[PDB]
């Protein structure tokens, strides 16, 4: 009857947008991470941290706008507004990249709030919390890429920047410096993504082509009401179709829909482990037996060595500007180039 | 020789590859878009050197 | 000694054997190139 | 090629050990009722 139970009743009121105890952490953190990105990409520059323009006010479009990471000299500083760097100045806070840690940290607790929102609502309606368990993969991906990776390198500088074009640069950086395509943990992560996209398309199409005729309309969408007890599509006909076309086929609905949870969730977890290894530069960059052979046999060539030559080009050409704090200066005569080009 | 510059590229396991690096190499750039079945080469040895199997597959 | 009432039997049907054999045979084919290196 | 010497026994046991684990559990299931 106390104030605690009175407050508990108000939070769990069945309204249009459910609040809940998790909302006290979710709503303010999700609103500031997004609003901070919209404020950054619209007004804020990145001239004194990267030497780049990155707002609509400077002339960037939706593809090139970004909230760039702080400079490399800032280290792993939290860059708090009241901290020893900005010293309370909001203008100087934006000029050194305070919004990047403002978005990463508020967005991190926002993810925690949303996952707690999945646990809270699942308990109230009395369902199994498998949706919350599935959200663990997007969280492990966000933590390893945006937090564990920059903490392993020199600073927040080499973390991803919240932008469409700044993310494309992130992948090309990982190809040239990490050979991230050769890492078997990204390969399993690729299989979990492309596999989940396969299951999502093949399950929805199989359902749409094995339905029962429960209606008189040529568009078979009105022949369904949520309160049936019978299946809307034939499970035994879909099993025979895929048994004769592909060889095997699902025979259990509960296993099928768990398999659609396991494949994409496990894939993202494996790719998060590979990024945790790259924070220490523990790469899958080379095959030693290949390099011992290719170094003493100038006629041995494989697609592995051809890709390493491409990696050596990405590093030597993008480094001077992508890493301006290093003050790289490469004369024209040291740049790796093929013939003519 | 995929690029047609007399620079062959090893692609099979018995020639120093693994599952990650092995590959069936595309046909030579000297052929271009020309149809190149087995019976257009003077033998199999010529057919394998110019990336013949890639088109058949 | 009286027997333990907490004991349960274990099962693994035929389909789970194929799925498991497929997983470790593919994980081996993927990782073997890195074991030899 | 100069590959690792333990890579052979690494792959062999990586296949064998979890294989027999599933095989033991399956044959003991079909021998039930």
């Amino acid at each position: 009857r106390g104030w605690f139970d009175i407050l508990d009743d108000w939070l769990k009121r069945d309204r249009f947008v459910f609040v809940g105890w998790s909302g006290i952490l979710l709503f303010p953190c999700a609103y500031l991470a997004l609003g901070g990105w919209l404020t950054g990409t619209t007004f804020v520059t990145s001239w004194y941290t990267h030497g780049l323009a990155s707002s609509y006010l400077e002339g960037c479009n939706f593809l090139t706008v970004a909230v760039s990471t702080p400079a490399n000299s800032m280290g792993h500083s939290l860059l708090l507004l009241w901290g020893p760097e900005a010293q309370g100045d909001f203008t100087r806070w934006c000029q050194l990249g305070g919004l990047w840690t403002f978005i990463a940290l508020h967005g991190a607790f926002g993810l925690i709030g949303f996952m707690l929102r999945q646990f809270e609502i699942a308990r109230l309606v009395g369902v199994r919390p498998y949706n919350a368990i599935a959200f663990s993969a997007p969280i492990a991906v966000f933590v390893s890429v945006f937090l564990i990776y920059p903490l392993g390198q020199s600073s927040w500088f080499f973390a991803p920047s919240f932008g469409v074009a700044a993310i494309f640069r992130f992948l090309l950086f990982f190809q040239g410096f990490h050979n991230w395509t050769l890492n078997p943990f990204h390969m399993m992560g690729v299989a979990g993504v492309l596999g989940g996209a396969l299951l999502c398309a093949i399950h929805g199409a199989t359902v749409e082509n094995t339905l029962f005729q429960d209606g008189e309309g040529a568009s078979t969408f009105r022949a369904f009401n949520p309160t049936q007890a019978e299946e809307t599509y034939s499970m035994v006909t879909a099993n025979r179709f895929w048994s004769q076309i592909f060889g095997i086929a699902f025979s259990n609905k509960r296993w099928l829909h768990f398999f659609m949870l396991f494949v994409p969730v496990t894939g993202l977890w494996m790719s998060a482990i590979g990024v945790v290894g790259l924070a220490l530069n523990l790469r899958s960059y080379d095959f030693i037996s290949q390099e011992i052979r290719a170094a003493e046999d100038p006629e041995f060539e494989t697609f592995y060595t051809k890709n390493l030559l491409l990696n050596e080009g990405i590093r030597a050409w993008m480094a001077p500007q992508d890493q301006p704090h290093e003050n790289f200066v490469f004369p024209e005569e040291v740049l790796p180039r093929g013939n003519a080009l | 020789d995929i690029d047609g510059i007399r620079e062959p590229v090893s692609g099979s396991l018995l020639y120093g590859n693994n599952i990650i690096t092995g590959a069936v190499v595309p046909s030579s750039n000297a052929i271009g878009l020309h149809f190149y079945p087995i019976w257009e080469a003077a033998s199999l040895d010529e057919w394998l050197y110019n990336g013949g199997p890639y088109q058949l597959i | 000694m009286e027997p333990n009432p907490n004991r349960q039997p274990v099962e693994l049907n035929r389909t789970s054997l194929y799925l498991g054999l497929l997983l470790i045979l593919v994980l081996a084919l993927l990782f073997s190139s890195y074991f030899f290196n | 090629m100069e590959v690792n010497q333990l890579g052979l026994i690494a792959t062999a046991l990586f296949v064998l050990v979890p294989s027999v684990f599933l095989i033991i559990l399956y044959v003991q299931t079909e021998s039930q009722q």
């Binding site: 060889g247 095997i248 | 396991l13 693994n18 599952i19 | 035929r14 045979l25 081996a28 | 052979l8 792959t11």
Partner: peptide
């Protein structure tokens, strides 16, 4: 030893296909 190890694993996966199709557990209706 490498080439024999890769093709041996490849042959097992193909042999695994033959049993998972023609020696599967029949799905039965009730």
């Amino acid at each position: 030893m490498e080439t024999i190890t890769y093709v041996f694993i490849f042959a097992c996966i193909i042999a695994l296909f033959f049993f998972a199709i023609f020696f599967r557990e029949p799905p039965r209706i009730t």
